[PDB]
Design a protein around this ligand. Structure first.
Ligand code: CL
Length: 184
């Protein structure tokens, strides 16, 4: 299966983010926006894995998920990847993700033991969309800059989820394979 580990947002942040997506629109650029139900914080893309590996991972996530207490985070600002001059991923950042950053590192090193490749510097983020090609660069850049410091709201990081993704014609469908609530 195709799988990944994620932290999900709440409705208010979700409503706020969709409206922001609608504001960015499709004039400055051709963008595949993430579906409302797929907006989350990716802790780690696992690529193709077996049901059997899926289980090993669950047991590790549970021993890690309990070592961290639930906290509130704030979704703020719009960032672009790779560069402001080479824009492909439009994303919303997180106001203080050190605890989230620390979780990601512990998940990364633990799964590395199983033969999993590590990843680039982790930046806690919620991808809002991906640019297929730019139409009007001045427009996009100015549109995005007006959202540089936007405060979209906050939610409570309360669980860690292992998910399965299935690619369908126009959209990837996600399925929660397991959820591990954090401590208190
Ligand atoms: Cl990506």
């Amino acid at each position: 299966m195709r799988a990944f580990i994620a932290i999900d947002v709440n409705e208010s942040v979700r409503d706020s983010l969709v409206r922001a997506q609608d504001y960015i629109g499709s004039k400055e650029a051709k963008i595949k926006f993430v579906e409302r139900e797929n907006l989350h914080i990716t802790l780690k893309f696992l690529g193709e894995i077996t049901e059997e590996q899926a289980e090993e991972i669950k047991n590790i996530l549970k021993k890690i998920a309990e070592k961290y207490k639930k906290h509130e985070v704030k979704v703020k600002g719009i960032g672009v990847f790779p560069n402001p001059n080479y824009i492909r991923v439009i994303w919303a950042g997180i106001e203080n993700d050190e605890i989230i950053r620390e979780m990601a590192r512990e998940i990364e090193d633990e799964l590395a033991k199983l033969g999993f490749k590590k990843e680039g510097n982790f930046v806690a983020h919620i991808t809002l969309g991906r640019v297929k090609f730019v139409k009007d660069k001045l427009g996009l850049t100015m549109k995005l800059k007006e959202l540089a410091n936007e405060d979209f709201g906050s939610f409570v990081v309360d669980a860690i989820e292992l998910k399965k993704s299935t690619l369908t014609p126009k959209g990837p469908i996600y399925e929660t394979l397991a959820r591990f609530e954090l401590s208190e």
